Amino acid sequence: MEGESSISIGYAQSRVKEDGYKLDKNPRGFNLKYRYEFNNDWGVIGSFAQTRRGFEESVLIDGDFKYYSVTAGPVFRINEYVSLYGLLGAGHGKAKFSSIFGQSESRSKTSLAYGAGLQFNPHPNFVIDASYEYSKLDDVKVGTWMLGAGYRF
């Protein structure tokens, strides 16, 4: 009820699109969420997420794409089993390139990130968390799904 924290860790996967094309394969990573309930009805929740996809060519070129976000928002409990939340924060996207010819360069952008999710408590001490997040970084669109689990105490 009042003063309950929930901590969860989860898998995260992004679909990254620009101008009708999708980056292959999808960046993947993790999501950590921390929630604190002020009372039986309202609380706050914070989220960090990161997904990555690396690429290499050998016999030599390499690059990687990384997205991470920090978001937060109110979380409302419906009953003992289910709570819903919305999130707002910042997303940062980065594409980094390097070769044996000397090139080492990146492109990056920070913009708003928007999210929404829910937490399910099959028992009062457990959490299953699922959320979606979206960020537009210039003309690159990053949509991220997250599915996690953890504990409530």
Ligand X SMILES: CCCCCCCCOCCOCCOCCOCCO
Ligand Y SMILES: O=S(=O)(O)OC[C@H]1O[C@@](COS(=O)(=O)O)(O[C@H]2O[C@H](COS(=O)(=O)O)[C@@H](OS(=O)(=O)O)[C@H](OS(=O)(=O)O)[C@H]2OS(=O)(=O)O)[C@@H](OS(=O)(=O)O)[C@@H]1OS(=O)(=O)O
What does the per-residue mask of binding to ligand Y show for 52-71, with x meaning CB under 6 A? Answer: --------------x-----
Closer of 127 and 140 to ligand X (Cβ): 140
Cα–Cα distances in angstroms (integers) from residue 49 to residues 32, 34, 121, 122, in the given order: 6, 12, 21, 24
Closer of 18 and 56 to ligand X (Cβ): 18
Cα distance between residue 63 and residue 54, in whole Å:
6
Q: Should residue 40 be labelled a site residue for ligand Y when binding is judged by CB under 6 A?
A: no
Closer of 62 and 86 to ligand Y (Cβ): 62
Return the residue of 15, 17, 94, 136 that touches ligand Y, per CB under 6 A: 94
Q: What residue 65 binds from ligand X, ligand Y, none (CB within 5 to 8 A, per partner kind)?
A: ligand X
Binding positions for ligand Y, rule: CB under 6 A:
66, 92, 94, 96, 106, 108
